[model samples]
Target: DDNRPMDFAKDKNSATLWAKKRKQVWLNNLSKAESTSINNYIKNSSEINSYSIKKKFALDNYEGIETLNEDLKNISTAVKKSMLTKPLYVYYYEANDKFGFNQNLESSLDSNIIDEEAINNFAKKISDTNFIQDGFKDVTMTEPDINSKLPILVHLKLPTNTPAASYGNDEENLRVLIDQGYSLKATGLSIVTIKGKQYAKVDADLIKQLNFENDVISASQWGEENYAPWLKELTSNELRDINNYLGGGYTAINKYLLDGTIGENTSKEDLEEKISNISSALKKRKIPEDIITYRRMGPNEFGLDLNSPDYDFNKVENVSKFKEKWLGKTIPVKTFISTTVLSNNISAFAKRKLILRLHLPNGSNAAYVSVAEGYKNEYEVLIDHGYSYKIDNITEYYDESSLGGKTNKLIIDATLI
Candidate 1:
């Protein structure tokens, strides 16, 4: 009997019946001002729809309620009421008592359920606490482990029907709140279902905000903790340099090194020495291997002349061997290679695209950029210069779409040795 549908209209007739009964009780208790305020709030809020609210509260439809066949329905009013209230948990604070919902504050509503005054008071209380607190009864919190490393990933669970107006666009208020204390930012808002209940999840990184001095560990310390075994060969200074480059310092230094004024004033010998130092550090950086990354290239780069008038699969060199030859059996990239962790990221590159599936293994020279340092939405994984990958397999496919015509695609799977 406690099992109620999470979504409206799932068990339409029964839900509507119970919803209407509750709505009636709520309406009867509501004052004219309260009723008008509730109606106006629902109408003005872009986050929720009237029909959904109607279904949720079982309020009368604008077109009037549909009469259900008496024989088709069987739940009693008391049973429906119990089902509705059972799923919901209400909490309130009592003054001075620091105890429960009873005593000096007077006990707590359906018309009172969503009173503007009550809501504002609640908002004020939450705003005062900055929405951060430990457990009070009936509330559950799932937090990251205390011992978890910096850049703590937290998935905050929210009500399925949370008002959009309650949160600023792009989680502006949430970012502001976290930045105020934790120096973190929120990203990745999603809906997730668990045990048949739906909840909203917000992703945030809580690294810089934590006050623990040890929480700000160096990249080498992080590697040691993660047991990045290959990185043990690197000197402490080497690891620091690698971390700086991967942490986005490379761009700044690279810009400064190349600036017309700076480059002209600096001695050529000193500039070469600095550049060599950077190059050596980059080459020595150990990229965590066995992780997958992708690169998109034009078909010509893969040795396939897609635009040729007489291009035919039969006349072409063994397509697989041809691809390997062009990429080299063990290709060594001389410059830093920008790649994505997601294959779909290459979709915008070309119609006749050649996708390089680069799998990093032990000893692969690459850097895993922190979420804050990488290209936004790209999920970038940078392969260092002097990195080599051996071709493992090559496959091709043609995609035919209704409006986009046909696309010739090739996939080359390679792994770092």
Candidate 2:
């Protein structure tokens, strides 16, 4: 240590400069990272929260409607720890004059809007890989073969209503799209349906959420609440207070559960198949962010009761004694969480927890359970009865087998999805 004559003003000035620079760098990195996280989170929202179905609507048949291609074409990227990581994939499905329409609602249409050039440009930007660029005809558009063992995923979006002037009568355009890939036979009240076309499906986008996840057992085991302890120590250190974790402050735990299969490995991929389960689970609770981390009751779970002699949640307070009581017991397929929903006006970083009783599985097999925010008599049937359980945790949590003989049994804990 060199002890030099340090002027107070000079020392203060230097320290201020360092702090400003550090803050600037931190803000810049946060802005970039959050933008990427938000965009990818949007796509993930679609995959886990939504059910995909093929719908084809006619323009003159689809004049007002637009293909989701332009929107889906944008590929997003994220970089952390100097590694380029892709959290989501983006692409579009399109077609050209693949079929002729009959006078019966098939003829009057605008020039086909299937601009493969635009699609090509967008692809080149996102994944930096130019896809099959020919208009719908340049590629062989077909459905994912159902017999294949791998997951077959695709999404089709139809073009907007024809320009509305000459091609205003789009009865035939609808037919052409259905002929291309729309699922004509399927119909739901809230969904679009074309009378004739059903084959208009295309690859909207695809993602192997747990890229190497398939290398192991089920992917559901990778639910964020799974391997929570290590993930909190690894990703977020600021909020890992035992009080924060066990009480209401459990965001680190929630994020860890989302990042990997925390408690047990349920995902087909080694990585946890993260859904916005934690976010949704916390919606019912009103915890304050500044004071708590997140609690992992279990996957997609809640702690308040639908059945109890004393069911008043008004008395639920963050008492260490209250939480300490349930520390060692693990219940059968039920888990819960406690977290804040709105924090500093941004909902993304709200902490959560797994609530309710968790029982340690007999013989050390790793166990898991699913959770939901609340129970409703109206849609009780929609409630998931059981969790996509994971018995293996170490190998599932740590991607290598060098940590041998550790089945899901040895590593056991509770978390939220």
Candidate 3:
């Protein structure tokens, strides 16, 4: 019964077609263990949960055919998410086996194992669009034996402002940056790979093909600072707006809540109740509960100290002038907590962290807490001294577009996903 590499029948049933496409992706994106396990299951197991398998390994429920065709990309994402502990090694090698290059590329760049002249020669022999004039010329050259790690070959056009530097920041330099297993972004081709997903070529087909839009750095965020004005055309107003938006928290609700609003007349019980209600509301909307906490912080009680050194007292108090200052700058942030510290003890959580659980007029609230690094260790030290506190790095965010919404309207379909 070990017909492991069996193929689906040549029928045009939609679900069957979908299942087969998922199977193709499962095979395509497998790590060594994942590859072996899935393939063995298909060949050896007489009965298989085809429907569940399809759902499980689906690269795209709607567009598996397009995303899955590019080999090893599909299941690799899932496998990496689940089992991959180290950084994934993404190689940009020749599309065809005919173009033979040395795999043993240890300092061959500085040592000239494959020099610039040889690359042009290789380009001439087997013409690759990735390495011609107006091409992804900065070829990667890694050490020979290091290739044993989980690697996936990809075809991509690495955009360059000028001709890519000769043997600069290519695969030649990748090994030393990592000791073969820690996480670091490969800065080779104006690329940003975050959380096992690679993103490159803003506003282009390759990024879309890779389905890398989620990791795309906003043009408004990193664009003007890292790039020149000539490249993407940002005006003076736009630049100022970006600065204003990121200049600490500028949202109306954020300002209102963070202005130390609970005054002498302000009811601690009422404010605490409202904060508790906001926490409940946030949970109902699918925001994580770990970030939601309650505190008895009023002037009469032990609230956050106003005289604290870290307090940004400049947070806008005057809503009207604040509106004028940030008038056109209120661009849509992805709408979630940018940072927080997670802990269990309600009293300890309040004392050790400065968290803002601000609710918009729009019924959305998320916690933003300052990163209190080493505070947990300090908490332990204090506990040893018969006092207790806690601080640890924990962050949360919920994208509006991601489901857990009405109708779950977008189902990872072709165009939107």
- Taken over the whole model, the C-alpha lDDT of each candidate is 0.37, 0.23, 0.25
- The sequence of per-residue lDDT tens digits that candidate 1 reaches over residues 1-417 is 324443322233444344444445544654555444334433343222222222211111223223211101111111122223222211111121111101111113331122334333322221211111111111112221233211112343222321111111222111100111112123343333333322223343222211111121333243343334434655565556556565655544454444522445556565444445556654555654344567775555444576653234333455434553543256665445666555442335534446676665556655544333223344555565555666554555443332212443455656555
Q: For model 2, give the 10-residue run with minimal summed lDDT.
A: 51-60
- Candidates 1 and 3 compared: the better one by lDDT is 1
What global local distance difference test value does model 3 have?
0.25
Q: Give TM-scores for every candidate, taking all chains together and pairing residue i with residue i.
A: 0.33, 0.18, 0.18
Among the numbered candidates, top TM-score falls to 1
lDDT tens digits by residue: candidate 3, 1-417:
112112111222432333343334434554665454334333432222222222222212223233223222322233333221222222243222112222222224443122445433333322211111110112232212232221123322222221111111222232111000111112232222323322221111111111111122331222223223222343444333323333442343233344535546546564444433433323332222211222212221123254543222233332223223322121222222222121111322222222222111112232121111222221110000011112111111111221211111101110000
- What's the CA RMSD of model 1 in angstroms? 23.6
Ranking by TM-score: 1, 3, 2
What TM value does model 1 have? 0.33
True-vs-predicted CA distance for residue 74, candidate 1, Å: 35
Please tell me which predicted candidate would have the highest lDDT against the true structure: 1
The better candidate by TM-score, 2 or 3, is: 3
Clashing pairs in 1: 19-58, 182-209, 289-360, 289-361, 290-360
